Scaffold this active site. Structure first.
Site, PDB file in Angstrom:
ATOM      1  N   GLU B  35      -2.947  -3.344 -16.231  1.00  0.00           N
ATOM      2  CA  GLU B  35      -3.762  -2.518 -15.308  1.00  0.00           C
ATOM      3  C   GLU B  35      -4.936  -1.889 -16.040  1.00  0.00           C
ATOM      4  O   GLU B  35      -6.069  -1.959 -15.541  1.00  0.00           O
ATOM      5  CB  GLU B  35      -2.970  -1.357 -14.700  1.00  0.00           C
ATOM      6  CG  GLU B  35      -1.930  -1.760 -13.622  1.00  0.00           C
ATOM      7  CD  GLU B  35      -2.553  -2.349 -12.352  1.00  0.00           C
ATOM      8  OE1 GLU B  35      -3.793  -2.256 -12.173  1.00  0.00           O
ATOM      9  OE2 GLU B  35      -1.771  -2.874 -11.512  1.00  0.00           O
ATOM     10  N   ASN B  46     -13.573  -0.589  -6.199  1.00  0.00           N
ATOM     11  CA  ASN B  46     -13.334  -1.819  -5.417  1.00  0.00           C
ATOM     12  C   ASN B  46     -14.434  -1.955  -4.328  1.00  0.00           C
ATOM     13  O   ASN B  46     -15.018  -0.958  -3.923  1.00  0.00           O
ATOM     14  CB  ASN B  46     -11.925  -1.825  -4.853  1.00  0.00           C
ATOM     15  CG  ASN B  46     -10.858  -1.773  -5.946  1.00  0.00           C
ATOM     16  OD1 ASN B  46     -10.805  -2.668  -6.783  1.00  0.00           O
ATOM     17  ND2 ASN B  46     -10.004  -0.718  -5.952  1.00  0.00           N
ATOM     18  N   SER B  50     -12.878   2.168  -2.206  1.00  0.00           N
ATOM     19  CA  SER B  50     -11.855   2.827  -3.002  1.00  0.00           C
ATOM     20  C   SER B  50     -12.056   2.547  -4.486  1.00  0.00           C
ATOM     21  O   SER B  50     -12.709   1.596  -4.883  1.00  0.00           O
ATOM     22  CB  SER B  50     -10.426   2.458  -2.550  1.00  0.00           C
ATOM     23  OG  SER B  50      -9.960   1.216  -3.084  1.00  0.00           O
ATOM     24  N   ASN B  59      -4.821   4.164  -6.819  1.00  0.00           N
ATOM     25  CA  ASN B  59      -5.929   3.976  -5.843  1.00  0.00           C
ATOM     26  C   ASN B  59      -6.269   5.244  -5.024  1.00  0.00           C
ATOM     27  O   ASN B  59      -5.383   6.015  -4.614  1.00  0.00           O
ATOM     28  CB  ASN B  59      -5.602   2.793  -4.931  1.00  0.00           C
ATOM     29  CG  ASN B  59      -6.740   2.354  -4.079  1.00  0.00           C
ATOM     30  OD1 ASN B  59      -7.695   1.683  -4.532  1.00  0.00           O
ATOM     31  ND2 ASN B  59      -6.626   2.660  -2.814  1.00  0.00           N
ATOM     32  N   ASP B 101       7.878   4.757  -2.955  1.00  0.00           N
ATOM     33  CA  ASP B 101       7.333   4.614  -1.592  1.00  0.00           C
ATOM     34  C   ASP B 101       8.029   3.545  -0.720  1.00  0.00           C
ATOM     35  O   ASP B 101       7.890   3.540   0.530  1.00  0.00           O
ATOM     36  CB  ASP B 101       5.812   4.384  -1.684  1.00  0.00           C
ATOM     37  CG  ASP B 101       5.139   4.436  -0.341  1.00  0.00           C
ATOM     38  OD1 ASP B 101       5.221   5.470   0.366  1.00  0.00           O
ATOM     39  OD2 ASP B 101       4.525   3.416   0.030  1.00  0.00           O
TER      40      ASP B 101
END
EC number: 3.2.1.17
Lengths: 113, 129
Positions: B35, B46, B50, B59, B101
């Site tokens: 990453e 991006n 974002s 993000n 999540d």
């Protein structure tokens, strides 16, 4: 012009790897993580929640715009390809890479506040 | 700050990521390598408006607030700039919320592409932990 459902979410199994399916049900879960976004679809109460992966670099841009309009409990029809190549078995068993996401109806959800 | 491999492995361990949601330490070192290349300042905008921030490229749409991403949710309740700190505490806390999540580490595309299902223990080999 939304396509007819081909499979129940519980019928999405590794055997279907590499074939096109159409699933129809409600949005059980949404996760937006940036480059990956996942919508899980259910069509049976207390049943499967099959994960539909949108991955930047793989999924067409327009479907990310559709993902943005999605809410839990929205009724959807999603056409996609099953992927079940290892290491998918480590967790989900299957993944669906979509080519079409259709929203049949948006849920009228009532905010709690 | 750019962490060394073992230096990161030690910090991540201190921060209780070893087997957090069932993911061994190597998974987290492997995810940071692919990453951010271990760089806590890593920042990538991006095309969708974002941006991804920090050692684990969190993000700005759902997770942290950077003031400029439409449809901000800030689920980690931190500004995005906190994820750029020499101190990885904010990234670790937000990563732990993300990995909880409902999709496990599939929330990280680098992890999916480079780490998931590989010999992730190689990432902490030679360290003395």
């Amino acid at each position: 012009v939304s396509p007819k459902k081909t499979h129940w979410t519980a019928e999405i199994t590794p055997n279907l790897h590499g074939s096109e399916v159409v699933v129809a049900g409600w949005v059980a879960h949404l996760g937006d993580y940036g480059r990956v976004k996942i919508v899980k679809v259910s069509d049976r109460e207390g049943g499967a929640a099959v994960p539909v992966y949108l991955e930047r670099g793989k999924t067409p841009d327009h479907l990310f715009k559709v993902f943005a309009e999605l809410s839990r409990e929205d009724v959807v029809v999603i056409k996609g390809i099953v992927e079940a190549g290892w290491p998918v078995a480590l967790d989900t068993g299957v993944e669906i890479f979509p080519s079409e996401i259709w929203i049949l109806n948006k849920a009228k959800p009532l905010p709690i506040d | 700050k750019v962490f060394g491999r073992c230096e990161l492995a030690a910090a991540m361990k201190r921060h209780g990521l070893d087997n957090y949601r069932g993911y061994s330490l190597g998974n987290w070192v492997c995810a940071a390598k692919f990453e951010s290349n271990f760089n806590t300042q890593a920042t990538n905008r991006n095309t969708d408006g974002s941006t991804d921030y920090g050692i684990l490229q969190i993000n700005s749409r759902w997770w942290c607030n950077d003031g400029r991403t439409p449809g901000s949710r800030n689920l980690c309740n931190i500004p995005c700039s906190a994820l750029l700190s020499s101190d990885i505490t904010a990234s670790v806390n937000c990563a732990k919320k993300i990995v909880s999540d409902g999709n496990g580490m599939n929330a990280w595309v680098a992890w999916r592409n480079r780490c998931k299902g590989t010999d992730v223990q190689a990432w902490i080999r030679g360290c003395r932990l």
